[PDB]
Design a binder for this molecule. Structure first.
Ligand SMILES: [Mg+2]
Lengths: 188, 188
């Protein structure tokens, strides 16, 4: 019945959450995107309403922004993915009940990546707005660098950045294996 | 080469014509037409265009138009009106408007943002929005914020939308789009 479907929906969501984290960790972003679309479709169905599915959903949301943050005028999004990731991080802190101290480093990381990635994609205009808006020795360099100079520290790695954010997010998640994976292994 | 320049010239006329019709639809509360015209414009924006103001207005109008709409949206952390707040700031900045000119409209959006969340069962978001963007009315909402909307928490979204359009419209050019002028001449 309804309760049965809801129970399975929760199982399914948690399994895919697990597999998406695995794909992201192994840098299989294509698989992460596909698995995330499945979870996106399942969210319309009734789930364990109150369940901690919400924490799981914020994480997926944060990872989605980061995964696309490296990429015409979009009438549907004023913010660049990473600027949006900043908002999500504030929601994770508030929802996971994290102290400002445990989140501070990640924040600054997302903020720096937000400006730098825009510079690398050659959009100093947006890099400027973001730089001015968010976030002092680095600021100067970036501003000066905003004068169109890439060979200056603008040589960071988005991969290294993504993986570091994933570890931050994982450090606040349970380590439990999804019931479906458990059954899959037992089915041999 | 010359063909590409001609196509760009037409794309601009088309974009401006539909912008004019989008505003007309919005002004006449024909939001269905607004959405359809807006989708035409979105498809146009990917093509070579040989304005940025026209873009921000459509963006702002788009968030407002969907401000009352109803699961977990993994694509957007912010409610439409929260996003409208950002767009309006970009408009103030990009349109070089004084704070005295934007202040009134800014409060309207913020107020609608909380009231709309209240009109839904989203009391937490309501409180979250208020404690972030926003003295009596502020207290009145904090007070109302408790499963009881009949206390003023029953305003007019239609009035809100038209006031916003009027404000946005006050900073635009009144000239008719070239295509509309040609259409009128076609009847003569
Ligand atoms: Mg009317």
């Amino acid at each position: 019945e309804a309760r049965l479907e809801e129970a399975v929906n929760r199982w399914v969501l948690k399994f895919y959450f697990h597999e998406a984290l695995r794909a992201f960790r192994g840098s299989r972003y294509g698989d992460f995107r596909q698995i995330r679309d499945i979870m996106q479709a399942l969210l319309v169905r009734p789930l364990g309403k109150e369940h901690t599915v919400s924490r799981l959903l914020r994480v997926m949301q944060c990872l989605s922004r980061i995964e696309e943050g490296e990429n015409s005028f979009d009438m549907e999004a004023e913010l660049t993915p990473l600027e949006s990731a900043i908002n999500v991080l504030e929601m994770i802190k508030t929802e996971f009940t994290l102290t400002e101290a445990v989140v501070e480093s990640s924040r600054k990381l997302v903020k720096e990546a937000a400006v730098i990635i825009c510079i690398k994609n050659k959009e100093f205009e947006k890099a400027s707005k973001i730089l001015k808006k968010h976030m002092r020795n680095d600021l100067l360099n970036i501003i000066r660098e905003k004068n169109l100079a890439h060979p200056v520290i603008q040589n960071f790695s988005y991969e290294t950045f993504q993986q570091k954010m994933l570890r931050f997010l994982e450090s606040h998640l349970d380590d439990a294996e999804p019931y479906l994976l458990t059954m899959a292994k037992k089915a041999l």
